[PDB]
Amino acid sequence: MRTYTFDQVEKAIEQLYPDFTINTIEISGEGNDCIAYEINRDFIFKFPKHSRGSTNLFNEVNILKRIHNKLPLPIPEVVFTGMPSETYQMSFAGFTKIKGVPLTPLLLNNLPKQSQNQAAKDLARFLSELHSINISGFKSNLVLDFREKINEDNKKIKKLLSRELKGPQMKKVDDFYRDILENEIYFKYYPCLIHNDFSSDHILFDTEKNTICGIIDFGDAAISDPDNDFISLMEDDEEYGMEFVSKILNHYKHKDIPTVLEKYRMKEKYWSFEKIIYGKEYGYMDWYEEGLNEIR
């Protein structure tokens, strides 16, 4: 993982954009992929911490440029782009800053009833139009076939933990994976463009108008199961919970809710294996031992 000084940030931006004058730099945020910098209090620059994070940044920029005028809610606008190298697919990207605070479950529940329902309606409309965007012009490395993922993940876990787990333990893991693959409900979806990380941290809110004013972080966006965008908001622990999501599914006119709940229960048990794999593909070895003990 690469860390940046504040001098290096301006130095990279100045090389490509010399006529752009920088006044102040603030570490706006920090995720598993990039470091965020707020510049001129109206721009958000993302710098990849590693190669894989640069790939997601590269993917985010390309997706935003294709759907910038196809959505009912504001999304990040790309205004600056970096260059590719032997280590990064894109050195950085500058976005127009969307003003507002994350619509955390606490803020949502404190809203007037009419505002909460308006939020559900606006979210459902956003997801409805997002999942209706023509995926023809889109690439295919963004296509995420879930059956291919589960099969691939099975081989990864097996390759990773063949020297960690005992014989019957590995077979138990294989049993879990086999039960998933024989359940046709997880794979008979209609592929469409999804946000794929649709959570409260990525939903900006205007506390003045009491309406959602933006959706951010499209770095995980892909062509996959539309139900993914509902189950990511469905968690009761850190998200909105079933009741609010039910309102979304209503406006979304979802014809098959029980199978969305079935997918949700599956993903929650599967998170242990995600932490093992994500803890390898994205560094962060802390997740590795965390998920390692869980599956035992």
Q: Provide the b/e sequence for 68-89 (b: ≥16 CB within 10 Å).
A: eeeeebbbbebbbbbeeeeebb
Fold of 6-96: Phosphorylase Kinase; domain 1 (3.30.200)
Which DSSP string corresponds to 260-271? HHHHHHHHHHHH
CB 265 within 8 A of CB 185: no
Which DSSP string corresponds to 77-141? PEEEE----SS-S-S-EEEEPPPSEE--HHHHHHS-HHHHHHHHHHHHHHHHHHTTS--SSS-SS
CA 87 to chain centre: 22
How many Å apart are CA 161 and CA 149, to the nearest integer?
18
Question: Does residue 147 sit in helix, strand or coil?
Answer: helix
CB 22 within 8 A of CB 41: no
How many Å apart are CA 14 and CA 31, to the nearest integer?
24
Structure resolution, Å: 2.0
Per the annotation, does 172 bind a ligand? no
Per the annotation, does 206 bind a ligand? no
Per the annotation, does 201 bind a ligand? no
How many Å apart are CA 59 and CA 67, to the nearest integer?
12
Per the annotation, does 33 bind a ligand? yes
Per the annotation, does 145 bind a ligand? no
Per the annotation, does 46 bind a ligand? yes
| Ramachandran quadrant class, 217 (left: phi over 0; alpha: psi -120 to 50; beta: rest) | left
Per the document, the length of the chain is: 296
CA 134 to chain centre: 20
Domain coordinates in residue numbering, the chain: 6-96, 100-296
Per the annotation, does 207 bind a ligand? no
CB 94 within 8 A of CB 60: no
Integer-rounded Cα radius of gyration of the chain = 20
Per the annotation, does 19 bind a ligand? no
How many Å apart are CA 236 and CA 195, to the nearest integer?
20
Fold of 100-296: Aminoglycoside 3'-phosphotransferase; Chain: A, domain 2 (3.90.1200)
